[PDB]
Amino acid sequence: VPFVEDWDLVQTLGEGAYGEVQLAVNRVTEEAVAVKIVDMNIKKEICILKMLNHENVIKFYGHRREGNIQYLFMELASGGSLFDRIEPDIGMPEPDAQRFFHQLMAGVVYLHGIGITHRDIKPHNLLLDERDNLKIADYSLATVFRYNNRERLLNKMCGTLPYVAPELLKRREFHAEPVDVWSCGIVLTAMLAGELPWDQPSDSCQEYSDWKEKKTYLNPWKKIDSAPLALLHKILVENPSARITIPDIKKDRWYNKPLKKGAKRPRVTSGGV
C-alpha cells in the first residue's frame, strides 16, 4: 500500500546497497514498471540513465524526489534475472546460451558506442522480459569512458571478483572495453557450465593458473563443447590488448553457428494466413 504520485508500489523485486526496487503499477493506466527507491553520484547515474535507448538495455522513464527519497522509474523485465535460469553444475541448453550471448553483446556494443561502461556485468544484472529478451540493468557503477571521441582510462577498482578482468587488479589504469568483454566471457562460462571458473583472476588462484596452463580437462571447461570453448579461449586472455574485441567476437565460429529454432508462428486473431 505505499505509492508515489499515480503509482502503487506493490511488490519488492530486490534490494540495493543503498536502495530497494519495487514493482510499480499505474492506478489509471495499469502500466507496470520497476522503481528503484534510494534513501538520500545518483546525479551521475541519472545522467547516464537518460542516455539509454536500446532494446537490450533497461530504459529509464524519469525520476521523482520526495524529501529524502529518490525514485527512479525504469522499464520492467518481468522474467527476472538470467541468474535464475542457470542450473547449478549444468548451465542451460547451448542454443539458449547463444541467444542470450547474442543479446548481451548487442547491449554491450550499444553501451560502448555511447561511451558508457557498465562495469558489473554478471547474470544477476541481466534481466529477461516476458519473451526472454535480455536487458542489462543497474547503472549504479556505470561510467563514461569515452567523451567527445576521446577515451579515458579507468582507475577505480569495482565489480565482482569472479567476473572482474585481471588487469583491473594488476594495472594502475586500464581500458574499459576489454574489462566488460572479460565479464561477458565469465557470464558465457556460467551459462554453459552452471559454475564459475575461479574466485578471482589472480596469480595466487589455482583455478586461474590452471586455465592459463590450458588444463581444460578440469571443470568447468570440460562441460563446454569445443566451439564455444574456442571462443572462451579468445575472451579469457590475460593481456587486455591481446584479448578479442567485440567486432571479432562477431566473427567467431560458435557465435555464428546456427543452433536455435525460431518461435512458432503467432496465433491468428483476425484475417487469414
Q: Residue from 58, 82, 97, 190 that binds Cl ion (CB under 5 A)?
A: 190
Q: Residue 10 annotated as binding?
A: no
Q: How far is the CB of 179 from Cl ion (least distance, A)?
A: 20
Q: Can 120 be counted among the known catalytic residues? A: yes
Bond into 220 cis (ω within 30): yes
Residue whose C-alpha cell is 508515489? 4
Q: How far apart are CA 62 and CA 64, in angstroms?
A: 7
Which among 220, 224, 231, 226 has a CA at the least distance from the CA of 256? 231
Residue 136 or 190 with smaller CB distance to Cl ion: 190
**Span 4-23, contacts to Cl ion by CB under 5 A:** none
CB 58 within 8 A of CB 135: yes
Which of 133-141, 142-150, 188-196, 247-255 is the region at the interface with Cl ion (rule: CB under 5 A)?
188-196
Q: Residue 32 annotated as binding?
A: no
CB 90 within 8 A of CB 196: no
Helix (H) or strand (E) holding 26, with range, is: strand 19-26
- Other residues' Cβ atoms within 10 Å of the Cβ of residue 151: 12
Q: Residue 79 annotated as binding?
A: no
Q: How far is the CB of 195 from Cl ion (least distance, A)?
A: 5
Q: Residue 21 annotated as binding?
A: yes
- Residue 184 sits in the site that holds Cl ion (CB under 5 A): no
Q: How far apart are CA 255 and CA 119, in angstroms?
A: 23
**Size, binding site for Cl ion by CB under 5 A:** 1
- Other residues' Cβ atoms within 10 Å of the Cβ of residue 181: 25
Residue 57 or 128 with smaller CB distance to Cl ion: 128
Give residue number: closest CB to Cl ion. 190
Q: How far is the CB of 194 from Cl ion (least distance, A)?
A: 6
Catalytic, out of 8, 39, 84, 120: 120
Q: Which three cell numbers stand for residue 44?
A: 551521475
Q: Which three cell numbers stand for residue 123?
A: 547474470
Q: Residue 20 annotated as binding?
A: yes
Torsion of CA 185, 188, 190, 194, to 10 degrees: -150
Which of 64-72, 182-190, 201-209, 265-273 is the region at the interface with Cl ion (rule: CB under 5 A)?
182-190
Q: Residue 17 annotated as binding?
A: yes
Binding site per annotation, positions: 13-21, 36
**Catalytic residue annotation:** 120
| Contact residues: Cl ion, CB under 5 A | 190
